Design an enzyme around this catalytic site. Structure first.
Site, mmCIF file in Angstrom:
data_model
loop_
_atom_site.group_PDB
_atom_site.id
_atom_site.type_symbol
_atom_site.label_atom_id
_atom_site.label_comp_id
_atom_site.label_asym_id
_atom_site.label_seq_id
_atom_site.Cartn_x
_atom_site.Cartn_y
_atom_site.Cartn_z
ATOM 1 N N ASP A 66 0.827 -1.208 0.000
ATOM 2 C CA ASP A 66 0.000 0.000 0.000
ATOM 3 C C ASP A 66 0.865 1.265 0.000
ATOM 4 O O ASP A 66 1.861 1.336 0.725
ATOM 5 C CB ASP A 66 -0.882 0.065 1.243
ATOM 6 C CG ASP A 66 -1.845 -1.112 1.377
ATOM 7 O OD1 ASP A 66 -1.623 -2.164 0.734
ATOM 8 O OD2 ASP A 66 -2.821 -0.982 2.153
ATOM 9 N N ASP B 88 -6.371 7.173 -1.753
ATOM 10 C CA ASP B 88 -7.152 7.378 -0.524
ATOM 11 C C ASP B 88 -6.270 7.521 0.698
ATOM 12 O O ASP B 88 -5.156 6.997 0.732
ATOM 13 C CB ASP B 88 -8.220 6.304 -0.284
ATOM 14 C CG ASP B 88 -9.358 6.355 -1.301
ATOM 15 O OD1 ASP B 88 -9.666 7.437 -1.832
ATOM 16 O OD2 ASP B 88 -9.971 5.297 -1.553
ATOM 17 N N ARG B 89 -6.791 8.248 1.691
ATOM 18 C CA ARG B 89 -6.115 8.521 2.970
ATOM 19 C C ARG B 89 -5.032 9.588 2.828
ATOM 20 O O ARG B 89 -5.149 10.668 3.412
ATOM 21 C CB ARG B 89 -5.536 7.259 3.615
ATOM 22 C CG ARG B 89 -6.561 6.174 3.848
ATOM 23 C CD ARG B 89 -7.278 6.368 5.170
ATOM 24 N NE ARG B 89 -8.036 5.183 5.556
ATOM 25 C CZ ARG B 89 -8.807 5.094 6.642
ATOM 26 N NH1 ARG B 89 -8.944 6.128 7.469
ATOM 27 N NH2 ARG B 89 -9.453 3.957 6.903
ATOM 28 N N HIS C 133 -3.806 -8.281 -3.533
ATOM 29 C CA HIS C 133 -3.882 -7.205 -2.566
ATOM 30 C C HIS C 133 -4.359 -7.648 -1.170
ATOM 31 O O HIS C 133 -3.675 -7.410 -0.151
ATOM 32 C CB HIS C 133 -4.777 -6.089 -3.068
ATOM 33 C CG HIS C 133 -4.818 -4.958 -2.115
ATOM 34 N ND1 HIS C 133 -3.718 -4.162 -1.894
ATOM 35 C CD2 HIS C 133 -5.755 -4.574 -1.224
ATOM 36 C CE1 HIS C 133 -3.999 -3.295 -0.945
ATOM 37 N NE2 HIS C 133 -5.226 -3.525 -0.524
ATOM 38 N N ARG D 266 -14.390 -6.166 8.411
ATOM 39 C CA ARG D 266 -14.669 -5.213 7.334
ATOM 40 C C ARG D 266 -16.080 -5.305 6.759
ATOM 41 O O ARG D 266 -16.508 -4.396 6.043
ATOM 42 C CB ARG D 266 -13.662 -5.401 6.194
ATOM 43 C CG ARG D 266 -12.205 -5.252 6.603
ATOM 44 C CD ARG D 266 -11.300 -5.613 5.442
ATOM 45 N NE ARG D 266 -9.901 -5.743 5.840
ATOM 46 C CZ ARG D 266 -8.993 -4.765 5.834
ATOM 47 N NH1 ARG D 266 -9.296 -3.524 5.448
ATOM 48 N NH2 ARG D 266 -7.747 -5.037 6.209
ATOM 49 N N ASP E 43 -3.988 -0.281 -3.442
ATOM 50 C CA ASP E 43 -4.116 0.811 -2.464
ATOM 51 C C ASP E 43 -3.117 1.945 -2.669
ATOM 52 O O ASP E 43 -2.370 2.329 -1.762
ATOM 53 C CB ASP E 43 -4.023 0.267 -1.039
ATOM 54 C CG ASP E 43 -5.287 -0.422 -0.593
ATOM 55 O OD1 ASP E 43 -6.191 -0.672 -1.414
ATOM 56 O OD2 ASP E 43 -5.348 -0.785 0.591
ATOM 57 N N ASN F 2 -8.610 -2.882 -2.958
ATOM 58 C CA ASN F 2 -9.970 -2.460 -2.609
ATOM 59 C C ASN F 2 -10.159 -0.942 -2.594
ATOM 60 O O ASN F 2 -11.282 -0.473 -2.757
ATOM 61 C CB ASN F 2 -10.419 -3.041 -1.269
ATOM 62 C CG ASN F 2 -9.589 -2.544 -0.102
ATOM 63 O OD1 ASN F 2 -8.361 -2.628 -0.110
ATOM 64 N ND2 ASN F 2 -10.256 -2.023 0.909
ATOM 65 N N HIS F 3 -9.075 -0.182 -2.401
ATOM 66 C CA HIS F 3 -9.149 1.261 -2.524
ATOM 67 C C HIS F 3 -9.090 1.793 -3.948
ATOM 68 O O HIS F 3 -9.234 2.990 -4.135
ATOM 69 C CB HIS F 3 -8.121 1.967 -1.627
ATOM 70 C CG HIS F 3 -8.619 2.189 -0.236
ATOM 71 N ND1 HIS F 3 -9.351 3.301 0.107
ATOM 72 C CD2 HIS F 3 -8.527 1.438 0.888
ATOM 73 C CE1 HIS F 3 -9.673 3.242 1.383
ATOM 74 N NE2 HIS F 3 -9.185 2.123 1.881
ATOM 75 N N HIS G 6 -2.684 -4.610 1.967
ATOM 76 C CA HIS G 6 -4.053 -4.382 2.506
ATOM 77 C C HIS G 6 -4.062 -3.766 3.901
ATOM 78 O O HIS G 6 -4.633 -2.689 4.084
ATOM 79 C CB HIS G 6 -4.868 -5.697 2.457
ATOM 80 C CG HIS G 6 -6.348 -5.555 2.636
ATOM 81 N ND1 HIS G 6 -7.075 -4.503 2.136
ATOM 82 C CD2 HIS G 6 -7.251 -6.396 3.192
ATOM 83 C CE1 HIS G 6 -8.356 -4.683 2.402
ATOM 84 N NE2 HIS G 6 -8.488 -5.826 3.044
ATOM 85 N N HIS H 171 -1.127 4.556 -0.670
ATOM 86 C CA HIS H 171 -2.180 5.431 -0.120
ATOM 87 C C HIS H 171 -1.866 6.926 -0.211
ATOM 88 O O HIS H 171 -1.871 7.624 0.809
ATOM 89 C CB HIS H 171 -2.501 5.051 1.339
ATOM 90 C CG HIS H 171 -3.432 3.895 1.465
ATOM 91 N ND1 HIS H 171 -4.677 3.883 0.873
ATOM 92 C CD2 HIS H 171 -3.307 2.714 2.109
ATOM 93 C CE1 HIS H 171 -5.277 2.743 1.146
ATOM 94 N NE2 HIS H 171 -4.464 2.014 1.886
HETATM 95 O O1 LIG Z 1 -8.236 2.572 4.741
HETATM 96 C C1 LIG Z 1 -7.377 1.669 4.825
HETATM 97 O O2 LIG Z 1 -6.343 1.818 5.503
HETATM 98 C C2 LIG Z 1 -7.593 0.397 4.065
HETATM 99 N N1 LIG Z 1 -6.696 -0.267 3.314
HETATM 100 N N2 LIG Z 1 -7.354 -1.368 2.761
HETATM 101 N N3 LIG Z 1 -8.676 -1.313 3.197
HETATM 102 C C3 LIG Z 1 -8.832 -0.244 3.999
HETATM 103 C C4 LIG Z 1 -10.133 0.139 4.634
HETATM 104 C C5 LIG Z 1 -11.289 0.134 3.843
HETATM 105 C C6 LIG Z 1 -12.525 0.482 4.404
HETATM 106 C C7 LIG Z 1 -12.605 0.843 5.749
HETATM 107 C C8 LIG Z 1 -11.450 0.854 6.535
HETATM 108 C C9 LIG Z 1 -10.215 0.503 5.984
HETATM 109 MN MN LIG Z 2 -6.685 -2.542 1.020
HETATM 110 MN MN LIG Z 3 -4.580 -0.251 2.590
#
Ligand SMILES: O=C(O)c1nn[nH]c1-c1ccccc1
Ligand SMILES: [Mn+2]
Ligand SMILES: [Mn+2]
Length: 312
Positions: free
Chosen positions: A65, A97-98, A175, A223, A94, A126-127, A250, A67
């Site tokens: 990741d 996001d964040r 991932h 999750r 990933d 997933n992000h 992840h 991010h």
């Molecule tokens: O936000 C993150 O750190 C993350 N990295 N992979 N999945 C998540 C995630 C997705 C939904 C809610 C919380 C964390």
């Molecule tokens: Mn992820």
């Molecule tokens: Mn992640």
């Protein structure tokens, strides 16, 4: 400003781009557009399972990741060298996001994918999906820097990202992780029609969302989708598909990596001091054709401009 040379990415453009981005400047919309449409074409032609051969003298770097932590991404390339045909990379989902430099990360990664299509690999996380982007900052960031339409195009490019990569028929990279049902094989992964948002359950969901647990069997995920999977789940999957181990990402880890399930489930996470808050180290992995065993390289966060996490 960075410009394509006859509508094509070059090593010169990529150096200019990274410097442009370091200085908090925006890549012109036409160049962003062209990177996106060209890389969509590249990714759309790939299998859902990328199968890569690593010769005895060759290596590969696996990152987890990122991010939107663009300044840490540049640090990876300073510590480990820029991508090339002789220094290949896999970034394991990933990317966005964040972190509040997600646009800079993802356009930098797509740029290198266009420059070194056979040696620079991007797997979906997933992000790289709408529900995550909508909540966790990437949609907002793209809308702030470009337009809502530019975001729809990113979403559509994300849909063509492969879901896993297999090295020398022996290391499988995804991932999230392994599956909520028994008997899933590499054949099933190859046959996932992946150009979509992931389903609520199924192999595509599991590859993006699942997590290892120390205890045997499976559990409902914290999750809300996919599962937690135990050491016996990993052991059986690997034996049934003639594989040595898996590399996943992840989850944040304090050391930037984790070696679970008897050495058979490895986590790699490449976002140090996650969200400027977690104080974790990050890591990347080296693999060699002569030796597929993972060599971990740990690293700490570098300074970045004064823009807080999740600003968008
Ligand atoms: O936000 C993150 O750190 C993350 N990295 N992979 N999945 C998540 C995630 C997705 C939904 C809610 C919380 C964390
Ligand atoms: Mn992820
Ligand atoms: Mn992640």
């Amino acid at each position: 400003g960075p410009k394509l040379e006859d509508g094509k990415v070059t090593i010169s453009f990529m150096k200019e781009l990274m410097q442009w981005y370091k200085d908090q400047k925006k890549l012109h919309r036409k160049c962003a557009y062209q990177i996106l449409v060209q890389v969509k074409e590249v990714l759309s032609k790939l299998s859902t399972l990328v199968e890569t051969t690593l010769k005895e003298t060759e290596k590969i770097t696996v990152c987890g990741d990122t991010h939107g932590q663009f300044y840490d991404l540049l640090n990876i390339f300073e510590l480990n060298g820029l991508p090339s045909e002789t220094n290949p990379y896999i970034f394991n989902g990933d990317f966005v996001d964040r972190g509040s430099f997600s646009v800079e990360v993802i356009l930098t990664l797509f740029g290198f994918k266009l420059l070194y299509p056979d040696h620079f690999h991007l797997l979906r996380g997933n992000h790289e999906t709408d529900n995550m982007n909508q909540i966790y900052g990437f949609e907002g960031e793209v809308k702030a820097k470009y337009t809502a339409q530019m975001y729809e195009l990113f979403s559509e490019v994300f849909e063509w990202l492969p879901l896993a990569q297999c090295i020398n028929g022996k290391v499988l990279i995804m991932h999230g992780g392994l599956f909520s049902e028994d008997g899933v094989t590499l054949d099933d992964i190859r046959k996932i029609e992946r150009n979509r948002q992931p389903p609520d359950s199924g192999p595509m969901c599991d590859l993006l969302w699942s997590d290892p647990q120390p205890q045997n069997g499976r559990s409902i995920s914290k999750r809300g989708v996919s599962c937690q999977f135990g050491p016996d789940v990993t052991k059986a999957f690997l034996e049934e598909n003639n594989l040595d181990y898996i590399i996943r990402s992840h989850e944040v880890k304090a050391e930037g990596y984790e070696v679970a399930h008897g050495g058979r489930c490895v986590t790699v996470f490449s976002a140090p001091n996650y969200c400027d808050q977690m104080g974790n180290k990050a890591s990347y992995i080296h693999l060699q054709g002569s030796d597929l065993r993972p060599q971990f390289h740990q690293f700490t966060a570098v300074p970045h401009p004064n823009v807080k996490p999740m600003a968008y």
